[PDB]
Amino acid sequence: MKVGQDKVVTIRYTLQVEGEVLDQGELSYLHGHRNLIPGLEEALEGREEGEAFQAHVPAEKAIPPHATLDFQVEVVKVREATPEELLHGHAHPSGHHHHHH
């Protein structure tokens, strides 16, 4: 499945700024709901599950001022959102736990 609006996407990433690793890990987000750094979400659009890629994200689409955010990203999983995720506007952990905010 390809990354797109209303998909919950799991990525593994390393973030460098000026050549230094600042963060690394794995996260899941609901795509198309302004829940991720915009330039990173833009880089992810249309990517296939399994794809690995580098993205340069300027501060003006996202740490010192006006530095480039250099991401190394793997698309781990792509699935469709549940109705509850769509209503809440965010991704939920695998285990069903009905709730509101």
């Binding site: 990433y13 973030l15 890990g25 996260l27 991720l36 750094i37 740490i63």
Partner: peptide
Amino acid sequence: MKPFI
């Protein structure tokens, strides 16, 4: 917004 840094 994510990632939380």
